[PDB]
Amino acid sequence: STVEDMTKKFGTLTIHD
Amino acid sequence: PQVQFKLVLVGDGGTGKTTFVKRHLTGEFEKKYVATLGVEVHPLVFHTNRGPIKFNVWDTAGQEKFGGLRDGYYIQAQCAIIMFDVTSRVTYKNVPNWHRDLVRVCENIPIVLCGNKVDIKDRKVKAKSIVFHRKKNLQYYDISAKSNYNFEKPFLWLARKLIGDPNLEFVAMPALAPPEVVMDPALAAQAEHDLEVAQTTALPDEDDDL
């Protein structure tokens, strides 16, 4: 689930601190 | 300044030579095509980190029947710009003719080849086709006098070759403090008349981003 793992990290991508 | 270099600007009629120079002199874009008769000499100064550098720009005529002292204008030129129009195939076909005539008089000078009018969507002289500069050791730039795309590049490059400094940069010319000048009634009515006419004359290119 290396793809599922990466998908979960993608979902928290932000431009903010 | 007294660090002045003679620049000859050559190319087919309507390629945008005069328009290009005028943009540098005043900031205006001229929309009308008033063909140059012979040559117009225009002094053009840039402020650099190595002091100011003046070009005596000999803007020559592209139309054959307005040619004047054709190659007589190139004598004692220290640099040049060859201009064509990327919307016009024939103006590129004639670039070698201009170069031939230029380097017969000016044997060893920095020359820039400029493809003008890249602002226009339907481009006729494709990028991959422009290769004439390679063997003749010309610098090449896509430019547009209209959009100002790369319009500074030709003068920055020639500045670098002529002064012999590759790190030369244009810098912000000094901005003196402007005067107060309270206005007299003696010039009010004439200024007011100009203002009247100005408000009721539409600004050009209102579809532009600025």
Binding site: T14 | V41, G72, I75, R104, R134
Partner: protein, 996 residues
């Protein structure tokens, strides 16, 4: 002042006054300079000025004045030469030759007046073009003779021969007749044995470097035409590749000679020639390594430093290496003894490829392309270049350009793609480690992470799906980690954008992983609320880019999802797009339209279409109800914007849906055309109430925007419509009613050229079905547009361009419409076409000539009938003479090919007896006379009056040639080009038109 004295020719020329005027031009400034310039232009353009030229060369001391005297001579020699008495010609020759000998004798003048000497040489060369070798058989012998005496004269004779070579072989095509070009080439070719001996003598013996350089300059020119034996069966290759590569004065020119040598025409089946081609390359590379710089040298630093001639030399070296290796690298690939030479040559190119110079990089990139393509296809080659290719991967990646620079980016992508196929592991390793040097900070910058993203994105689809999957996961993981590390919105925005760029470049990955695709798109939606500059545009551009590739995955029901994702998108569309600017919202809707077009179930597609158009349709209906209740509300510029934006939304969805958009068009069509009218009346009212200046106001431009977007929507639908029956029966008649009269009855400045554009499409797609409709379009737009655009070439440029597009398509699709025109309006049609010819504007000119050609064909096709008979009587010679006018006037050279084609067709009609009636009126010529004979008589007369300096013989020959050649276009063209030369001079040879 007294400056204008020289223009009075009644007196002797005052040389002192001339030189003042010349000085004041070259050395002066301001008002002084401009006045002298006008005086010199007037002096020079005096046709009796050549007479007072020998006076100037002798008496004047100013080299500029002498230069200008020779310009006047030059103009006489090229134009009026053959008209002069024979003693004047010998006189001029004698004192051109004389001046050159005397200038070469004086070392002072020889050293310090090269400009004036070179000009005198060019002038001498013009005389040879006239008089050599028929009236000067001993020029070459006497030149070789006078070479022995003085080293200076010998140097100048090399400059003369160079210029002669240039004028005969390099610049003859445009400037002299075919017959005359051949004569001079055969003449040079005949005596070249003698010329070469002298050149090779000078190169082998070799005294003055200035002499040696001028000899090498001349050789470069000879290399364009001379047969290969002169290079391969003498010693000259050894000299060039060794002797002349060591000293820097000769190096520059010699390197260019070897570049041209690499291009010579050579038998490809002789081992001795193959070894010689290897040898001169081995010698050249050796001299580079030992006399200029080694293989390891940092050429990027050298080029940047820009000392002396280094930049030109490195440019020239790249040209030499690329040219030679493109042609010859195979010669170095089998022999193990040449293996080191091969890889060193390529290692120089790798180093040249690191130079910060866009145009140089392009030259090398073309070569790398040639190479890696060959390594991809050719057997047993790639192993040779493994280490070259490894270095190239890093060079390309680090200089990767944004996709916006289309030609360069495409070139970089192709090379990098080939390099990825040749070694995927290496490519991957390089990219991952570059990404690691972003994360540790050692190579971190906005520009650096951008270029890496563009590089990683470029190779999409080269790896296997399995490898790609692992690679993408690693890249995105790392980039996601990079974003988290970085502080501030500036930094995170850059990395987020690059994350989103890479994802958008890997649709195959997106297609195979729905959950991920879903997450991506939801993230883009979140970014559509970010105000930070660039972010919303990045979000929207990525969305439509992903959709363009992955649309099928939005339209089906993915497993574990309750519905197709398109349904989900449409439900939240208000919330999703709330913070976007209008034109961003439009992109969003277009993207949705792309997805909806994938659904081929008519019922479900229509439902999705209506669901997507919910907001604009509700806005629309409320605004139509409001504005039809009172036309006052359209003054309100807020309402004008809302309306324009609803129409644009419709344009956006129609753009991506084409034929499928019909139901949505139907929802708004009748009310939209009513709006068009109401808007139309509103505009006319403001112009009558405020004047022409009204058309420049924000309010009126707002209103015109509405009309234009309405015309754009209809054009867009009809251009893609599949059901042409509905277009004709439902759309076309209302559209014509709404727009044609409005156009016709507005003042010129209030007419929308977009009307013409819309009509062009309507005629294009369904013109064959609406004959009466096409008549109505002509009637409404033809005469009134023509009146706008037939006073000058500048005003109403859009109308001008759309006008000739409209007439073109009418002449293609529905010619019968022109037959209905009363004879007076048909005459304006012929006027209009001929008017297009005279344009410089390429869109108008090209259309002008096409209309002419197609009209002729249309008339031909009618056969022997009264309208075809009467068309020729009225308009044949108008077309012939108008076509001839733009061929011969020097102001329409862009149009030569089309003019030639038109003229040939016109002439072939008479030649083939395809015009039945006489082209001449009763008793103007004897009755039994053919059109053939009259055409020749008319043309003879026409050209005799237009060009009176031509002989009767010249004209008769030209027309003889032209009419016989009216079946072979390339030859016909040749004859025309010969005519264009001859009219620029006096005493052209009529026999030249017999050239075959």
């Amino acid at each position: 002042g007294s400056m204008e004295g020289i223009l009075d020719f009644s007196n002797d020329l005052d040389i002192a006054l001339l030189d003042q005027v010349v000085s004041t031009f070259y050395q002066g400034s301001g008002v002084q300079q401009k006045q002298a310039q006008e005086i010199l232009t007037k002096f020079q353009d005096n046709p009796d000025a050549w007479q007072k030229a020998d006076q100037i060369l002798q008496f004047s001391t100013n080299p500029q004045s002498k230069f200008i005297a020779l310009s006047i001579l030059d103009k006489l020699i090229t134009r009026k030469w053959k008209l002069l008495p024979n003693d004047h010609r010998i006189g001029i020759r004698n004192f051109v030759v004389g001046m050159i000998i005397s200038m070469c004798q004086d070392d002072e003048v020889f050293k310090t007046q090269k400009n004036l000497i070179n000009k005198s040489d060019l002038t001498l060369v013009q005389i040879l073009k006239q008089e050599w070798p028929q009236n000067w058989p001993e020029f070459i012998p006497e030149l070789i003779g006078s070479s022995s005496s003085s080293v200076n004269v010998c140097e100048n004779n090399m400059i003369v021969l160079k210029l002669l070579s240039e004028e005969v072989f390099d610049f003859s095509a445009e400037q002299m007749t075919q017959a005359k070009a051949l004569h001079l080439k055969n003449s040079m070719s005949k005596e070249f044995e003698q010329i070469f001996k002298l050149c090779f003598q000078v190169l082998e013996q070799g005294s003055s470097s200035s002499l040696i350089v001028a000899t090498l300059e001349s050789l470069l020119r000879y290399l364009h035409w001379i047969p290969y034996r002169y290079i391969y069966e003498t010693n000259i290759l050894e000299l060039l590749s060794t002797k002349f590569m060591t000293s820097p004065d000769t190096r520059a020119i010699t390197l260019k000679c070897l570049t041209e040598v690499s291009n010579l025409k050579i038998p490809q089946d002789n081992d001795l020639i193959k070894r010689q081609t290897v040898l001169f390359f081995q010698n050249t590379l050796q001299q580079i390594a030992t006399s200029v710089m080694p293989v390891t040298a940092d050429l990027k630093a050298t080029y940047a430093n820009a000392n002396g001639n280094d930049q030109s030399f490195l440019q020239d070296l790249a040209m030499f290496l690329t040219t030679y290796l493109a042609r010859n690298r195979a010669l170095l690939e089998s022999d193990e003894s040449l293996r080191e030479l091969l890889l060193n040559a390529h290692q120089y190119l790798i180093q040249l490829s690191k130079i910060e110079e866009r145009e140089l990089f392009k030259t090398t990139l073309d070569y790398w392309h040639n190479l890696v393509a060959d390594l991809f296809y050719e057997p047993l080659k790639k192993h040779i270049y493994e280490e070259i290719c490894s270095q190239l991967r890093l060079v390309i990646i680090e200089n990767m350009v944004r996709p916006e620079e289309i030609q360069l980016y495409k070139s970089e992508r192709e090379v990098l793609v080939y390099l990825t196929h040749l070694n995927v592991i290496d490519t991957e390793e390089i990219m991952i480690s570059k990404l690691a040097r972003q994360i540790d900070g050692s190579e971190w910058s906005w520009h650096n992470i951008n270029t890496l993203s563009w590089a990683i994105g470029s190779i999409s689809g080269t790896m296997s799906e399995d490898t790609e999957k692992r690679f993408v996961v690693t890249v995105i993981k790392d980039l996601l980690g990079l974003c988290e590390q970085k502080r501030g919105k500036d930094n995170k925005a850059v990395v987020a954008s690059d994350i989103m760029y890479v994802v958008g470049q890997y649709p195959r990955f997106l297609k195979a992983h729905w959950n991920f695709l879903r997450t991506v798109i939801l993230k883009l939606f979140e970014f559509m609320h970010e105000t930070h500059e660039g972010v919303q545009d990045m979000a929207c551009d990525t969305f439509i880019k992903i959709v363009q590739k992955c649309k099928y995955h939005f339209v089906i029901q993915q497993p574990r999802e309750s519905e197709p994702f398109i349904q989900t998108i449409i439900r939240d569309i208000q919330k999703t797009t709330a913070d976007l600017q209008p034109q961003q919202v439009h992109t969003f809707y277009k993207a949705c339209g792309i997805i909806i077009s994938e659904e081929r179930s008519v019922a479900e597609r229509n439902r999705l279409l209506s669901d997507l158009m919910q907001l604009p349709n509700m806005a629309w209906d409320t605004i139509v109800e409001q504005s039809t209740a009172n036309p006052t509300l359209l003054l309100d510029s807020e309402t004008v914007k809302i309306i324009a934006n609803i129409i644009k939304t419709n344009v956006a969805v129609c753009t991506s849906m084409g034929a499928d958009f019909y139901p949505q068009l139907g929802h708004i069509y009748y009310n939209m055309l009513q709006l068009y009218r109401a808007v139309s009346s509103m505009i006319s009212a403001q112009v009558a109430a405020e004047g022409l200046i009204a058309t420049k106001t924000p309010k009126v431009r707002g209103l015109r925007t509405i009309k234009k977007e309405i015309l754009k929507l209809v054009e867009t639908y009809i251009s893609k419509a599949r059901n042409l029956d509905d277009v004709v029966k439902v759309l076309v008649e209302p559209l014509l009613n709404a727009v044609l009269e409005d156009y016709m009855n507005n003042v010129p400045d209030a007419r929308d050229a977009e009307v013409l554009n819309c009509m062009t499409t309507v005629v294009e797609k369904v013109g064959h079905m609406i004959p009466q409709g096409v008549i109505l379009i002509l009637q409404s737009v033809f005469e009134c547009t023509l009146d706008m655009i037939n006073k000058d070439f500048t005003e109403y440029p859009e109308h001008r361009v759309e006008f000739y597009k409209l007439l073109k398509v009418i002449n293609e699709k529905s010619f019968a419409a022109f037959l209905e025109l009363p004879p007076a309006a048909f005459k304006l049609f012929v006027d209009a076409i001929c008017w297009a010819f005279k344009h410089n504007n390429r869109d108008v000119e090209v259309n002008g000539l096409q209309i002419a050609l197609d009209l002729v064909k249309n008339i031909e096709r009618m056969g022997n009938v009264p309208f075809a008979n009467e068309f020729h009587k009225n308009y044949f010679f108008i077309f012939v003479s108008e076509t001839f006018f733009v061929l011969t006037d020097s102001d329409h050279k862009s149009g030569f090919s089309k003019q030639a084609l038109l003229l040939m067709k016109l002439i072939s009609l008479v030649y083939d007896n395809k015009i039945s009636v006489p082209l001449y009126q009763e008793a103007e010529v004897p009755q039994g006379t053919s059109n053939q004979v009259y055409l020749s008589q008319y043309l003879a007369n026409m050209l005799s009056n237009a060009f009176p300096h031509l002989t009767s013989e010249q004209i008769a020959s030209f027309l003889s040639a032209l009419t016989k050649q009216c079946k072979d276009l390339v030859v016909f063209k040749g004859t025309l080009r010969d005519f264009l030369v001859q009219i620029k001079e006096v005493g052209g040879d009529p026999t030249d038109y017999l050239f075959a």
